[PDB]
């Protein structure tokens with residue numbers, strides 16, 4: 001069975017964990033420890049093809065990342081770059097995560113999708129047009145999602161898988 005290692009990155013609080021849990025477990029989580037980084041697997045069918053999705057949900061903040069206990073970006077085949085549409089700071093930070101991915105992969109050609117999450121919220125501050133302009137400058141798809149309503153959730157992950165299949 002074909003395996004796809006996807007990595008979800010972005011600023012703290014944008015919904016990386018909520019997006020992952022919604023895709024895998026079909027439930028919206030109202031809170032999820034921001035320091036929890038883990039892989040979540042689920043068998044899906046995308047465009048008729050069976051595959052095993054391995055999703056690495058990252059913390060997004062060095063503060064949360066190192067908040068460990070008694071205990072990759074390298075192995076990831078595609079990346080979801082998430083901001084929240086009611087979080088201008090998370091959008092302003094997207095370039096940092098984009099540069100991180102290219103550095104850790106030593107490539108300009110990495111499968112990647114820009115995700116604008118929380119589109120169920122009315123207090124929007126990032127316009128769809130400006131997120132689209134940013135995605136065009138990277139040459140990557142832009143997808144609006146809501147981990148709460150499920151809008152765009154499958155589409156964001158499936159598009160990333162399709163970008164990986166295109167990348168061979």
Ligand SMILES: Nc1nc2c(ncn2[C@@H]2O[C@H](COP(=O)(O)OP(=O)(O)O)[C@@H](O)[C@H]2O)c(=O)[nH]1
Nearest residue numbers: 012013014015016017018029030118146147148
């Ligand atoms: N209304 C709404 N809230 C969301 C959405 N996605 C995440 N949240 C909330 O945003 C907060 C942070 O989400 P979380 O997944 O922990 O963000 P993370 O730090 O990037 O993993 C949580 O309280 C979630 O319930 C969404 O699409 N819509």
Ligand SMILES: [Mg+2]
Nearest residue numbers: 016017033034
């Ligand atoms: Mg999280």
